[PDB]
Structure formats: C-alpha cells, structure tokens
Paper text:
NA is a homotetrameric transmembrane glycoprotein responsible for cleavage of sialic acid from the host cell membrane. By blocking NA enzymatic activity, [name] inhibitors (NAIs) prevent new viral particles from being released from the surface of an infected cell, thus stopping the spread of virus in the airways. In this study, we applied a set of experimental techniques using recombinant NA variants to understand the molecular basis of development of oseltamivir resistance in the viral N1 [name] NA2009. To decipher the structural mechanism of resistance, we determined crystal structures of NA2009 mutants in complex with oseltamivir carboxylate.
Two variants ([name] and S247N single mutants) crystallized in the centered orthorhombic space group with two molecules in the asymmetric unit; the tetrameric biological unit could be reconstructed from two symmetrically related dimers. This interaction is not present in the [name] mutant, where the closest C-C distance between V223 and oseltamivir methyl groups is 5.0 Å. The energy of this interaction can be estimated as ~1 kcal/mol. This explains the 30-fold increase in Ki value for oseltamivir upon I to V substitution. The enthalpy change in [name] NA2009 was partly compensated by a more favorable entropic contribution of 0.6 kcal mol−1. The [name] and S247N substitutions did not have a dramatic effect on the oseltamivir binding pose. Rather, small structural alterations—such as loss of a dispersion bond with oseltamivir in the V223 mutant and changes in the hydration shell in the N247 mutant—appear responsible for increases in Ki.
Author numbering:
A (entry chain B), B (entry chain A), C (entry chain B), D (entry chain A): 82 to 468
Write the structure that this text describes.
Amino acid sequence: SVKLAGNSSLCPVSGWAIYSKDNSVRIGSKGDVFVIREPFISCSPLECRTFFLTQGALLNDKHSNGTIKDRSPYRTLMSCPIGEVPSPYNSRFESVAWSASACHDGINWLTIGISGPDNGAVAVLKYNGIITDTIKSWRNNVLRTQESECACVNGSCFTVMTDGPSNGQASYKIFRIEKGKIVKSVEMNAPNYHYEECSCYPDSSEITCVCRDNWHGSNRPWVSFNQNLEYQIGYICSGIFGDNPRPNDKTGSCGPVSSNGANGVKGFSFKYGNGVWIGRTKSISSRNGFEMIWDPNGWTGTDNNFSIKQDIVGINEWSGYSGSFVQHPELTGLDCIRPCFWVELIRGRPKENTIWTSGSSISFCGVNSDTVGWSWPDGAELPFTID
Amino acid sequence: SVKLAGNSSLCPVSGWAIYSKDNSVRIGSKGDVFVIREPFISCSPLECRTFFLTQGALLNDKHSNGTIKDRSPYRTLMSCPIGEVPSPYNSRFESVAWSASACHDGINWLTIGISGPDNGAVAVLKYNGIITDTIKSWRNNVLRTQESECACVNGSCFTVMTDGPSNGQASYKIFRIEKGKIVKSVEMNAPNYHYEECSCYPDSSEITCVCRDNWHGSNRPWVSFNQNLEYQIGYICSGIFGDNPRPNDKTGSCGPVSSNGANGVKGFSFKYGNGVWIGRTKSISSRNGFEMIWDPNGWTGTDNNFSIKQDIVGINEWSGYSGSFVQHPELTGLDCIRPCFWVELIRGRPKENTIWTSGSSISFCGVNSDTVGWSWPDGAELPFTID
Amino acid sequence: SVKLAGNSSLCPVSGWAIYSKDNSVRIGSKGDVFVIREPFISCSPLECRTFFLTQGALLNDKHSNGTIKDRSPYRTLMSCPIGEVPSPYNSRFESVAWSASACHDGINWLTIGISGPDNGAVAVLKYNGIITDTIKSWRNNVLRTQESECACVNGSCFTVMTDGPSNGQASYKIFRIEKGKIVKSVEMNAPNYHYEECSCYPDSSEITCVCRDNWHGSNRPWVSFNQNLEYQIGYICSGIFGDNPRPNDKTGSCGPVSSNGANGVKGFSFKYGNGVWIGRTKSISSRNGFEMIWDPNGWTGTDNNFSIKQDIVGINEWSGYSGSFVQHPELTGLDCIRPCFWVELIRGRPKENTIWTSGSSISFCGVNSDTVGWSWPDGAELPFTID
Amino acid sequence: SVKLAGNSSLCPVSGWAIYSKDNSVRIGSKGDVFVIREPFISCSPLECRTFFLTQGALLNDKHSNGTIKDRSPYRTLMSCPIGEVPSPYNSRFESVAWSASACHDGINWLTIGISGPDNGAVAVLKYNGIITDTIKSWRNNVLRTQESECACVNGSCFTVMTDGPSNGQASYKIFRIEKGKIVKSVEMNAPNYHYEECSCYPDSSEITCVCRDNWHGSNRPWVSFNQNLEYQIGYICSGIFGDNPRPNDKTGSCGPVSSNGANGVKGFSFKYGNGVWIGRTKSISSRNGFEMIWDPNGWTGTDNNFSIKQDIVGINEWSGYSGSFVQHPELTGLDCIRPCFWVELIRGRPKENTIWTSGSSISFCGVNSDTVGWSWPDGAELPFTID
Ligand SMILES: *[C@@H]1O[C@H](CO)[C@@H](O[C@@H]2O[C@H](CO)[C@@H](O[C@@H]3O[C@H](CO)[C@@H](O)[C@H](O[C@H]4O[C@H](CO)[C@@H](O)[C@H](O)[C@@H]4O)[C@@H]3O)[C@H](O)[C@H]2NC(C)=O)[C@H](O)[C@H]1NC(C)=O
Ligand SMILES: *[C@@H]1O[C@H](CO)[C@@H](O[C@@H]2O[C@H](CO)[C@@H](O[C@@H]3O[C@H](CO)[C@@H](O)[C@H](O[C@H]4O[C@H](CO)[C@@H](O)[C@H](O)[C@@H]4O)[C@@H]3O)[C@H](O)[C@H]2NC(C)=O)[C@H](O)[C@H]1NC(C)=O
Ligand SMILES: *[C@@H]1O[C@H](CO)[C@@H](O[C@@H]2O[C@H](CO)[C@@H](O)[C@H](O)[C@H]2NC(C)=O)[C@H](O)[C@H]1NC(C)=O
Ligand SMILES: *[C@@H]1O[C@H](CO)[C@@H](O[C@@H]2O[C@H](CO)[C@@H](O)[C@H](O)[C@H]2NC(C)=O)[C@H](O)[C@H]1NC(C)=O
Ligand SMILES: *[C@@H]1O[C@H](CO)[C@@H](O[C@@H]2O[C@H](CO)[C@@H](O)[C@H](O)[C@H]2NC(C)=O)[C@H](O)[C@H]1NC(C)=O
Ligand SMILES: *[C@@H]1O[C@H](CO)[C@@H](O[C@@H]2O[C@H](CO)[C@@H](O)[C@H](O)[C@H]2NC(C)=O)[C@H](O)[C@H]1NC(C)=O
Ligand SMILES: CCC(CC)O[C@@H]1C=C(C(=O)O)C[C@H](N)[C@H]1NC(C)=O
Ligand SMILES: CCC(CC)O[C@@H]1C=C(C(=O)O)C[C@H](N)[C@H]1NC(C)=O
Ligand SMILES: CCC(CC)O[C@@H]1C=C(C(=O)O)C[C@H](N)[C@H]1NC(C)=O
Ligand SMILES: CCC(CC)O[C@@H]1C=C(C(=O)O)C[C@H](N)[C@H]1NC(C)=O
Ligand SMILES: *[C@@H]1O[C@H](CO)[C@@H](O)[C@H](O)[C@H]1NC(C)=O
Ligand SMILES: *[C@@H]1O[C@H](CO)[C@@H](O)[C@H](O)[C@H]1NC(C)=O
Ligand SMILES: *[C@@H]1O[C@H](CO)[C@@H](O)[C@H](O)[C@H]1NC(C)=O
Ligand SMILES: *[C@@H]1O[C@H](CO)[C@@H](O)[C@H](O)[C@H]1NC(C)=O
Ligand SMILES: *[C@@H]1O[C@H](CO)[C@@H](O)[C@H](O)[C@H]1NC(C)=O
Ligand SMILES: *[C@@H]1O[C@H](CO)[C@@H](O)[C@H](O)[C@H]1NC(C)=O
Ligand SMILES: [Ca+2]
Ligand SMILES: [Ca+2]
Ligand SMILES: [Ca+2]
Ligand SMILES: [Ca+2]
Ligand SMILES: [Ca+2]
Ligand SMILES: [Ca+2]
Ligand SMILES: [Ca+2]
Ligand SMILES: [Ca+2]
Ligand SMILES: [Ca+2]
C-alpha cells in the first residue's frame, strides 16, 4: 500500500460516460434494501464504494415511516460496492451517523460520522474502522459535514464542517486529518458567505470545494486551499446558476446571488482555470432533472453563455443531491486525476404521497472520448404497498 | 497474473457434459432474483461467471411489468458465479447496458456495456471496472453487440458490433482491444450478409465468430480473423440449418438461405476443419428445445446429413439464446482450448401470459468421454403471483 | 497446499461432541432456504462444508411441490459453510446432480454429480470446478453413489457406485480418482450382497465403507480396500442391527440379516478392530430418533450386547440419513484421523401432510473428553403456509 | 499472525464515543434477521465481530414463538461483522449453544458453546472452528458462562463458568485455555458470593472480571487473577450500585448489598486503581435506560458520590445486558488496551405483548477526546405482524 500522491492535475474532459446505476428503489419494492439518503461514491486504489446514510429501516416496511426526518439515533453510515443496491446482506457498517464523509488515503479508509443531539453533536473519526479522533460541535447548532467524499493528498485528507444556522450566517471550518487524527484546523473568515455540504476534490496538490449556500445564494460558494490550510473563497461567477432553487439564467455574480437564494441542494462543480463543468438540476424550482454544462469562462465570468450541455436526467424526472468523486492515477493508471460525479434520485416525501423518503443513484466519469446525453431516472412506481 | 496465450487449438469433443444449471426462475418465485435476459458465461484463469442484462427489477414484483421491452435506462450488466441465481445479494455490478459483452485477458476483466438512446448509443468499455474507452453509434441505429463473451489472444481481446437495420443491410465492425482501449477496428465489407449477436471464440491465435442473420438467412453467418483484423466471411454450408426460425433440413447454401430467413435467435457453432458442432433449437419455428449436432462436413458442405445428435432441452420446453464460451489451458491445465456452451431458457412474454419476461440458464462443456442426452428445462410453473 | 497423507489411524473416541446445527427448515419458514435432501459434510485442510442436493426450489414456495420425487433435471449439488442454512445467497454451485459425492485431497475439491435419464445416467467429475472425467451407467438402471464424502489418501480419492436394482442383486464398483480423473476401477464380486449409499472413510492408508442393503439385509454391509483396490467384503456382525427398518435386537449375522431386510436408510459405522461405533435410528420401523452405540465386539461378533449408548435425537423426533465425515491431521493438528458424523432430519413427505420434503442437519465429532446425550431435533412446526 | 501480548495497561478514558448500532429489530420487521439474545462483541487483530445466541428462528416468523425461553436444542452461537444485522446470509456458524463465550488470542478464535440438558450440560471448546476440548457440568445444575468475550494474554485465554443455583450459593471456576485446550482450572473459594455472566478483560497481564450476583447483591462482584490463576475476590464498593434491580444510591458495601439483591442483569465495569467506570441501567427496578458513570473512588470506597455521568439510552427506553470488550494495541496501534462496551436492547417478552423476545445492540469505545450523551435506543415499533 502507498499513499495517494494527489499531485497531478484534473484530467480535461469533453463529456461524461455512464459508470453506475443501482436501481435501489425499484429493487426494494420486493428485496431487502435500506431506506437511504445522502449517498456518495468514494474510491480506494482498488475499488469504488457507495456510502450512504441509512434510516435503520428497509423499503416497503413500516419502519420506513417518517423518513423525511433528517436526524435520529437510528441513522448509520454504511457502504457497499458501487452499483449494488444497499442491503443488509451486502453492506459494511461504517459509523453511527446522520451526517458523514469518507475518503481513502491510499492505505486505509477514513470515515467521519456525526451523531448525538442537535445542540452538541460529535463527529467520530475512524481510520480502518478504529476510532482515531472526535470533534464536538463548536456552535451548538447541528454540527454537520459534506455528505460526499473528503479529499486526500500525500497522506493528508481534508474536509469542511459547518455549525450554526442554515438560514443565516454560520461558522465553517477546514480540517486536515492524517491517519484519522485531526492535525490542523482553521475557521474560514467568510462573512456574508454560506457553506453547506461541500463537494471537495484534489487537483495539483490543493483542494477545491464547491458547496451549497442555503442562506442567500442561488450560485454556489467555493473554497480552495493548500495542505497548510491557506485558503481562498468566492462564488461561481457564471450566470448559469448552479443551485436549486435558482432564477432563470441571466447575468451572474462573483458573490452570492440573492434571487431565489434561500434553500438549496447539495451539488458540485469542477474548475478548469476560468472555466467550469457545472452539474445542476434542470428545474429552477424543484429537484427535477439533471444536466452537465461546460462554461469555458464560468468560474470567473458572469455571462450566461455556455458551450456544451449534456443531459443526464430528464426535466420531468426526480433528481436530488449530487457530488464529485475522483479516481486517482494509483487506481486508473492515468497521468491525471479523473473527475466523476454521482446523482441521488430522491423518491417519496415531500413531493410524492408516501410515508417514506429514499433514493437511488447514478454515476458518471469524465472522458475525452465520445459520449451522449440521455435520461437515466430512478424508475420506481410509487406509491408502494406500505403506503 | 499472466495473459492468456490463446495459441492452442480447440479441444476435439465427442459430446457435451452438463456443467451448470441455475434454476433462476423457479427460485425467483420466492427469492430475490433479478429479471434478466441475454445471459452469458465467461471465465478467467480462476473462475467462471454468468453475466446478464438485468431489468432493474426482481421477479414476482410489480417492476417486472413490461420486461418484454429490450432497451431502457434501467438495464444493467451484472455478473455472479456460474450456477448461482442472479440476486442483488450475490451479483457484481459491471456496467449500465442494454447490450453487452465481456471477457478476461488473463489479467483483468473487460466489460462492454451499451446504453443511451437508439439514435446515439454509446458503448462504455471498462478494464478492471475502470472506464477505459467509449465508442459511439456510427449509423445512429441501435449500436449493439454480442450478448456473449469476447475472445482474447495474447493480451488482445476482440469483439463485433453492429449498427443499422435488423431487417436489411447493416454495418458490422470488428474491434481489437488491449487493456480496455480500442487499438484497431475495421468495417466488414459484407454486402448481402447480416451479422447480429456474434458468438466468438479463440482457436490457434485466430478468432472465429458465428452469428445471427436477422434479415434473410436461416443458416448462420460467420466471420473469422487474425490479430491484425484480416478477416474472412461466409455462411455455414450445412443443410442442418442453425437459426430459428428455419426450414426443415434440406440441401443448404454457403450463402444466406432465404427460406424462413427473416428474424432469428442468437446462437453459436464450433468449427473443426470441414466439420461443425451446431447447437440449435429443436423446433423449426419457435424457441423450443435444444440439441447439439456434429456434422463432419457441415462447415463447408451443403448436404443435410450429420453423424451425432445429443438432446439438451426437449422440443416441448422453452429455450432461447445460446452462446459459446471457452476454458483456456491456463484455467484447465489442458493442452487445448476447451469449448463449452450455455443456453438461455426464456420464460414469460410473448409465449406465456405474464407481465414479465425473464430467463434461466444451463451450460455444458465438451468432453471426449461418455455423455448422454436429456432435457434440462427451466421448470418454473407460470404464471406467477404477480401476474 | 499439500495432499492429505491419510496414513494415520482413526482416533479412538469415547463419545460425541456436538459440532453443528443449521435449523434450516425452521429458518426457511421465512427466509430463502433451499429445499434439500441428501446433505453431507466434508472438510478441506482449512474448512468444513455442507454439501446437499437441492430441488431447485425454496421452502414455502410453490416450486417445492412434489419434492418427495428423487430424480429430476432441476436437482443440483451445492455447498455452504457448515452450520449455515443452504440459501441461494451463501451457497456455491457444484454440479447438476440427483446423486453425489465430494471430497478434498488437500489441494482441490473433487465433486461427483450424476444426472441424466434413469437408463443412461452420467457421473460428471470436477476437480476445482473444472470437468475432469465422466462415467456412464454400465447397467442402465439408475447409476448412483454415496450421498456422502469420498475418501482420500496420498493424492488418490475413492468412491463406490451402484447400478442395477434397489430390490435385488445389483452391480457395485470401486473407483480410484486422482486430480478428478478415474485411474482404476474394479467391480466388486458380491453375490447375495447389496450396497447402496456408502459412507467411506480413510484409516491407516486404507478405505472402509459401511453401506445400506436395500434388498435383504437389516444389518449393514461393508467393503474395505487398499489403494490398489484390493478389497474385502462382509456385513457388520452385531445383533445391534444398524439399518432402518430392522428387527428388535437379537443374535446377528456376519451375512445379510433377512428379517425386515428390504428397504433401508443411508448410514455409517466406524470400525475399531473387532469393535464398532454404530449410529442408528431409535425406531425399528421409521426414520425417528438417533443414537450412537459402542459395541466392543460388534464388527465381528453376533451378540446383542453393547457397552455405551449416547442419545442424539429422541425417539419421537424425525431423523433421516446419516454419514461419516473425517477431520485429517492436516486440519486439526492431531496425530490421528478424527471421526465425525452428520444426521439429516427429514421433514415433510411421506410422514407429514405437506406438499414438500426437505431436511435440516446436525453433526458431531468424536472426542475422548466428556460428552452427553440429548435430543437435537429439527424443531420446525409443520405444516407450513404453502401446504 | 502473532499472539496478543496483553501486557499494557487499560487506556485512560474521559468518555465514550459511539462505535456501532445494528438496528436489528427494526430491520427484521421485513428482512431475514435472527431472533437473538445474549449478544456480545469481540475483536481480532484485524476486525471486530458481534457474537450472539440465535433461537434457530427469524423475526416475524412463527418459529419466533416462545423465545422468552432461555435453553433449547435449537440455540446456536453465530457471529457477524460488527454493526451488521445478524442474518443467515451474513453470519458465521460457531457452535451449538445456549450459553457462550469467545475471544481471539492473536492467532485464532476460541469459542465456547454450552448445550445439552440442564442436569448435564457440556461446554464445547473450538479453536479455529475445530473442537479442541470439552468440559461437563460438575454440579449438574445449568453449567453456564460469560455471554461476553473471554480475555487473552500472551497466548492464554481465560474465562469463568458457574454451576449450581442462580438463587443461592453456587460453584464458580476459572479456566486457562491455550489453543482451545484447558491447561489449568481452579474453583473459586467464594462463600457468600455469587458470580454469573462475568465481563472479563485484560489489563497489565492480569484479568479482571465484573459479574452479576443473582442471589443477594445489588452491587457487582469481581474476581481478578494472574496467569497462574491466583485470584482475588470482592464486590465493587461504590454506593452507585451497578446491578438491576438495585436500591436508590446510598452508602455502599465492599461485600454484597442485600437490598434488592436477588435477580440481576449482566453488566460490566472497568477498574482504574481506586476508581471505576460503571455502566448501568437508568431505572433502579427495570431493564430501562443506560448510562456510564465515572466514580474516582468507587472501586474501593463506599460513598454515593461520582464525578461524571454520560447518557447512553434514555430511561423510558428498553435496555438489557451489557458487557466489556477491548481493542488491543495489535489492532489499534495504541500503547494501551482500549476499553469498549456494548449494550443489548431487549424487545418483546416479558415487557411487551409479543410472542417473541429478541435484541438489537449498540457499542461505544473509550476516548480522551470530546464526547456527548444521548439516547440511542432500539427503535422498533412493537408488536409486529406475527403477534
Ligand atoms: C405511518 O404513520 C402514519 C402517521 O402516524 C400512520 O397513519 C396513521 O395511522 C393511525 C392508526 O390507524 C391513525 O390514527 C388514528 O386516527 C383516527 C382518525 O383520526 C383516530 O380516531 C384514532 O384514534 C382512536 O383510536 C386509538 C386506537 O384505538 C385510540 O387510542 C384513540 O384514543 C382513538 O379512539 C387514531 O389516532 C392516523 O389517522 C393515521 N394518519 C394518517 C395521516 O393516515 C400510518 O398508518 C403509518 N404507516 C405504517 C405502515 O406504519
Ligand atoms: C401442489 O400440487 C397439488 C397437486 O397438483 C395441488 O393440489 C391440487 O390443486 C389443483 C388445483 O386447485 C386441484 O385440481 C382441481 O381439482 C378439482 C377437484 O377435483 C377439479 O375439479 C379441477 O378441475 C377442474 O378445473 C380445471 C381448471 O379450471 C379444469 O381444467 C378441469 O377440466 C376441471 O373443470 C382441478 O383438477 C387438485 O384437486 C389439488 N389436489 C390436491 C390433492 O389437493 C396444490 O395446490 C399444489 N400446491 C402449490 C402451492 O402449488
Ligand atoms: C503458445 O504460447 C506459449 C506461451 O508464450 C509458447 O510457449 C513459450 O515459447 C517460448 C518461445 O519458444 C518460450 O521462450 C517460453 O518459455 C514458452 N512459455 C511457456 C509457458 O511454455 C508456445 O510455444 C506456443 N505455442 C504452442 C502451440 O504451444
Ligand atoms: C403493467 O403496466 C401497464 C402499462 O403501464 C399498466 O397499465 C396501466 O394501469 C394504470 C392503473 O390501472 C392505468 O392508469 C393505465 O390505464 C394503464 N396503462 C396502460 C398503458 O395500459 C398495468 O396496470 C400494469 N399491470 C400490472 C399487473 O402491474
Ligand atoms: C510487552 O510485551 C512486548 C511483546 O513481547 C514486550 O516487547 C518485547 O520485549 C522483549 C524483551 O525486552 C524484546 O526482545 C522484544 O523485541 C519486544 N517486542 C516488541 C514487539 O516490542 C514489552 O517489553 C512488554 N511490556 C510493555 C509494558 O511494553
Ligand atoms: C405460540 O405457541 C403456543 C404454545 O405452543 C401456541 O398455543 C397452541 O396452539 C395450538 C393451535 O391453536 C393448540 O393446539 C394448543 O392448545 C396451544 N397450546 C398451548 C400450550 O397454548 C400458540 O398458538 C402459538 N401462537 C402463535 C401466534 O403462533
Ligand atoms: C441541517 C442543515 C442542512 C444543510 C442545509 O440540512 C440538510 C438538508 C437536506 C436537504 O435539503 O435535503 C437533507 C440533509 N440530510 C440535511 N442535513 C442534516 C444534517 O440534517
Ligand atoms: C435490436 C436488434 C437486435 C438483434 C436482432 O434485437 C435483439 C433481439 C432480441 C430477440 O430476438 O429476442 C432480444 C435482444 N435484446 C435485442 N437486442 C437489443 C439490443 O435490443
Ligand atoms: C435409487 C435407489 C436408491 C437407494 C436405495 O434410492 C435412494 C433412496 C432414498 C431414500 O430411501 O430416502 C432417497 C435417495 N434420493 C434415493 N436415491 C436416488 C438416486 O434416487
Ligand atoms: C440460568 C441462570 C442464568 C444467570 C442468572 O440465567 C440467565 C438470565 C437471563 C436473564 O436474566 O435475562 C437470560 C440468560 N439467557 C440466562 N442464562 C441461561 C444459561 O439460561
Ligand atoms: C508527484 O508525486 C510523485 C510521487 O511521489 C513524484 O514522483 C512526482 O515527481 C510528482 N510530480 C509530478 C506529477 O509532476
Ligand atoms: C509527502 O509527505 C511526506 C511525509 O510528511 C514528506 O516527507 C514529503 O515531503 C511529502 N511530499 C511532497 C511532495 O510534499
Ligand atoms: C504477444 O504479445 C507480446 C506483447 O505485445 C509480443 O511482444 C509477442 O510477440 C506476442 N506473442 C506472440 C506469440 O505473437
Ligand atoms: C505418514 O505419512 C507422512 C507424510 O508423508 C510421513 O512423513 C510419515 O512417516 C507416515 N507415517 C506414519 C503416520 O507413521
Ligand atoms: C504417495 O504418492 C506419491 C506420488 O505417487 C508416491 O511417489 C509416494 O510413494 C506415495 N507415498 C506413500 C507413503 O505411499
Ligand atoms: C509468553 O509465553 C511464551 C510461550 O509460553 C513464554 O516463553 C514467554 O515467557 C511469555 N512471555 C511473558 C512476557 O511472560
Ligand atoms: Ca424476503
Ligand atoms: Ca441557495
Ligand atoms: Ca460563460
Ligand atoms: Ca434468420
Ligand atoms: Ca453433412
Ligand atoms: Ca435393509
Ligand atoms: Ca456385542
Ligand atoms: Ca443482584
Ligand atoms: Ca465515590
């Protein structure tokens, strides 16, 4: 085993090739599939895994009742191989958690699982399944983290956590973790910014995170930093607005776009100089559809012009959260860090007339070979028997 | 790990010994078994696996409705150990796919999964589960492939894909793939031929494929080629016609036999000089029954005489697709490439009054020791509870 | 890996310590557990496995209907770790089979699976899952074999097969198999003997088999042989009669005991000079109960006196088949071959009012430390929902 | 593989970080989950496992009827990875048992499973799954053991067993076991003490056990000993009484506290010089709630003062047994033996109106970093469909 270097650049990509689809909700109509939300993908040097927050319940069973609820003592972070349904019969137990992150440094898995009360939650860090550190809420108001993979460079892994209001100014911290132990942290000085649910990836030995402003931004905030946690902050400038909800596309801002700014959805983007690959919902108002857009000046420029759009999920179909994941050269044999992404396809409450909420997933990897747009939706027929 | 050499000849065989039977449909009446079609077997130097195209659904569940439909965004290529039922609890996720192939080069698995819209489908190639290439539709008319194993010689693996009409002239391409990357391709110049769903195997460092003419041939077309993709084409000459439907046996042709030539079924045959081992249905008109026939001059000669017939599935029982698979010396310890075959046993629509279509499988390997004919049919009692 | 020597003597034992219990039928009331009969245990240098003949159906499903029937094209030889229920989700596929044997030579598993028609059945031999030989019926009347483990000494494994009537004189052959290939066979010259379903074990480089006389013997026949297949034959002389059905105990015979001789049950015994450890049902008329009896002169002496009885299953509870299995020094670290046994606990038809027949199992290993009698029955409550 | 040294001291700990939660009962409402009680955790140098006593039945099936009953021939010791539900599809079979212990010496697992009749029960010892010893009841009155992990130092593992009344003086024995063989034992001379269900851990090459007085003590008895089995005995002195039932806290005793002393619950404590970490129920009278208390003089001092309390399960929620488990340096990389604990959350009879009794579990590990109190209860909604 060798630590992931993390020192190559992100691979340039022209489009997105489909990588996985689990069909979890369709399969759970009969099979024994966990009720889950907040899935994400992360890879080791040998395999990729889907992590997810269970609700300690199975689909089509009465204990799925009320699973719109975000935080409970029953939620657990578990993982299974990519593309398989999350069952009790194929899932590794990771941590007790209602908010999470995970990443592999080339040697072992780091998992971060937050549980406990809203006023005093505690993140439990594990390295190779052994508890190695904890960090407690510093603002006493729902300590919470990425819901996607952390990022690793040369034996150090990095994450972001938030504590404070989800509808006003909060507090945001960056962490450097080695072998599951926090070795450095800093509080971001980000007045008038809001960071939730960061999608962070490594690129040329530095970390870039694209997040969710739940307070007053319909474009996405970003934070980038080096191994010593020297950081920069901004908002994606493109008028191709990335959040949901959002306005119709128009001239953007390099600060928070107030129009339709409150609320949000976890997402991601990939920076390539001045340009950006944006994944977003197709609907401006609801978690419906998904598309990939290449805007060659959208990181730093405010116009609403773009060059390429690739369809992923059709506008009338359910989508949900999305997040980055990477494939390092140690896994692929390539000379660059490959960007990939996943989409959560949320079924049930609040939009559908069920007792439960759960998701399935799809994922894609960036290539420079030919690709095509389509719709790969969840495909379950609701309601279910239990509803 | 060492590349398969693929340089020995096919083992001579006098009969077919039963190797596996999964009983999937029987077991799926209660257990959590995928709705599948287009199964196939392929081996590594250590094990054999069943690959298959799921429908993103389980047997005896409502989401199995409409599974006569061939292409959807829910279909996935997955695999499980040979002889086990395909379940979410024992199946490896391979690719998102409504047409597929796979093969092991001695080092890692190559999978090929085609998804996307009919007018612009994309094959995603993976090597050890990592995307290594893509190829897009070149005729914009259902890019499609073998539905059985590709063939590997000395670190290069080979497949055939078709694009264009299934009821007229189409376009057929041969590919050479190394570590999941396309390194050579050629378009077969085959006016008046039709190639679908090729069953391809290695034999003395060259590849032989026996395929399905869906346009106007009731005998099977073949294509053989070396590593440089220098190819030859023809049709199996025997009057023991190989396709389904077909006429009653009579004097054959080394070109397409027009009588009952439209439509077809995936199949295979094994060439031994002038001779041929033909696997075919027992019914001339329907996907019923299965048998193996040794015709010692049937590759190159048009008579309707043969020497051996071995019963596999009775004429009153449902059959389906069939395909070759091989066991190389690196797996068996033999001095020759062993020929084997599988049969898909299709249940449900259109022949039976169900909401769904699914298959089970049986397989056999060639031996020079004593064998026997019998019928090993699917055995499920239809309809099911869901119907 | 090293071949099992097989040259030590059987360990002397004073009693039987409980080793496993699977509770398969109780668990299959809800879970996905195969309908099985003819289970047996066999060990490698690293683990022990339960082998069994499925009916290609699950408990409590309609396809379990009619499973009193012995031979069908749906039956398969599968295996799982000892003590686990046989499910599609934990079982390795071995062979298509309605009669079987298996054993590990220290390097790889040999499996023998007989399928095909009653008049022409064929045993398929596999070594490490690859077909290595076949043998066809020589009398055209249900070729059949042990339904328990074969026996291995120094790289050679040994079995017995029968072909011919189960109610009159038949033909019995001994086989020596190396790396899955038959290298020698002999027909036993056993006029007036009847051998079915032999339980064979190694002891000081020679094989001893204790079998079932279905024709006219209520004591058990035996055959012992060396590596060159030089054999001896006899019947267990004890008046503690071993078969079921049988008479009440009384003076025995060193030939077949005619009283209640027709029919039978598979069983076993362990020879220790003139003495014998006999496992038998408690009922003289039905497959009910089970007990272990130490008769210090019962191999060669005809009295009905014995020294020790250990209860295993109570007289009012269902039992079934039983068989030997051993644990070699390569597995245990001991200086002798440890004797063990299993019992099949048959539920359903013919004795119970169900549509199905299936079994669970228990097993024990011989020790020289303290032990105790009890009853470890199946414990399912019949009928089931499907009945 | 190397023997665990067991020569470092217990790690000092300021609080308890949540490690696992299985949600078994919730999941078993639909999935195939064993009815279990008497779970426990134990670790190797590579992983931690949950061991448990099944009832040979699944939740929400008829065979779960009557599972308030403690001892039957259907109960089996099995194990699964920590945090996963105990299912037939993920559980290793260990032993036939209605009382058990297990522990890993660094090389292989030792399991101890007691079965047989109440008047003559036999413990079967296995090492790497092979029977290595037995010990029979010496008082003919329910030979029984820890229901939690045994303790290993330098290749010797240690346990305690009891035989005789649970409501009066009984007989208690300590065992030293090497490679699954009993090499030493001694009968504890403990007139007027009562020891049941010991929770034993290693600490500086010696073993400390904290147990249950079911006769006449509401504080917990302890026994400590070196590798030669030279032992000391006493009761935890603290007026923070550890058993359930118990009185309200008040001045304690270093002998058995008679008030509310009959009956009990399995538990544990960790000694740190004069101090103690006590895990106990929150209710004085019922198996409800759970908490950890640090009493810095509570091992040797009788006051009812303590310094820290951490909430684990709320007073209105069901709890159950609890026990210690450790993580050795060979697993963690630490310089001390880490203390952890599990809690069984009992559902069903006698407190709830069901046909069955079963449990789920939670576990925590000791840390010197920040922690928080909460309630992590079972969460199933009873009764179930079967009731
Ligand atoms: C998922 O959770 C939902 C929400 O709890 C649940 O639906 C609810 O089911 C309950 C039980 O059927 C309903 O509660 C009843 O409502 C009626 C009508 O208002 C009341 O009269 C009932 O109270 C009487 O009966 C009780 C029991 O005898 C007495 O204790 C009480 O004093 C009254 O006499 C009772 O409250 C409730 O109306 C529904 N709610 C909705 C929106 O449907 C659903 O069943 C759960 N699903 C699963 C699978 O668990
Ligand atoms: C397991 O297998 C058993 C045995 O087959 C099966 O029980 C049988 O079920 C069938 C279907 O219910 C029964 O067959 C019927 O018997 C009646 C009474 O004799 C006949 O009148 C019926 O025939 C009429 O109806 C048919 C259908 O419309 C017509 O085709 C026919 O011409 C007649 O009009 C029919 O034969 C049979 O009686 C039982 N047998 C027993 C012993 O119960 C059982 O249901 C199977 N269980 C499972 C779970 O699969
Ligand atoms: C088939 O390919 C094998 C594997 O490469 C050939 O065997 C090798 O031959 C070369 C050149 O003569 C030797 O240097 C190697 O030592 C051989 N390797 C092994 C593992 O045997 C073989 O000659 C080829 N052809 C046939 C028909 O066997
Ligand atoms: C199988 O699928 C068909 C096609 O969707 C279902 O038919 C629909 O059923 C709904 C509910 O009754 C109606 O609103 C539509 O009129 C039907 N559509 C069509 C196109 O027929 C059918 O009900 C499904 N069958 C089962 C057994 O699930
Ligand atoms: C605990 O046991 C370890 C393991 O045996 C001891 O470390 C060994 O000490 C011996 C004798 O001094 C050396 O020869 C070995 O090289 C040591 N082995 C290892 C792996 O370190 C250690 O001294 C003991 N005690 C404590 C408190 O650590
Ligand atoms: C749970 O087990 C009890 C005890 O065996 C069952 O009670 C028996 O039920 C049968 C069928 O009604 C009767 O013949 C007996 O009179 C009952 N025996 C006793 C001792 O009560 C009970 O029915 C079972 N309950 C469930 C829900 O399965
Ligand atoms: C608590 C604020 C946070 C970010 C806005 O809300 C998230 C929004 C969610 C959402 O918008 O769907 C679901 C998340 N499970 C929830 N996170 C937690 C920890 O509860
Ligand atoms: C699309 C043409 C092609 C070959 C004739 O049709 C196949 C025939 C089928 C058939 O004859 O059963 C089923 C195959 N799933 C289908 N392939 C695809 C990709 O849809
Ligand atoms: C065919 C004769 C043979 C030995 C007497 O009958 C066996 C008896 C059986 C029995 O007595 O229960 C069940 C066996 N499954 C059957 N064997 C086969 C191959 O059918
Ligand atoms: C038999 C006495 C013993 C300790 C008091 O009872 C235990 C108490 C139990 C309890 O208090 O819940 C359940 C245990 N399963 C039981 N142990 C056995 C072996 O039956
Ligand atoms: C990246 O790190 C590797 C691994 O240590 C090192 O050898 C290489 O020089 C670095 N430089 C790059 C990618 O330019
Ligand atoms: C990677 O980390 C190691 C360990 O701290 C350090 O010695 C080395 O300089 C680092 N390499 C780079 C390229 O930063
Ligand atoms: C096999 O491929 C290797 C690597 O390309 C090549 O050098 C070698 O010549 C090939 N062997 C044969 C027998 O063609
Ligand atoms: C048994 O065989 C072993 C392994 O080859 C050999 O070394 C030994 O001498 C034999 N003799 C015995 C058990 O007496
Ligand atoms: C064991 O078999 C090997 C291979 O045939 C042989 O050379 C050896 O003599 C045999 N050993 C004994 C003790 O029979
Ligand atoms: C550990 O056990 C070994 C083997 O018995 C022994 O020789 C050694 O002295 C023991 N070590 C300690 C530290 O007691
Ligand atoms: Ca089920
Ligand atoms: Ca927003
Ligand atoms: Ca732009
Ligand atoms: Ca045709
Ligand atoms: Ca011919
Ligand atoms: Ca008889
Ligand atoms: Ca005698
Ligand atoms: Ca007490
Ligand atoms: Ca105190």
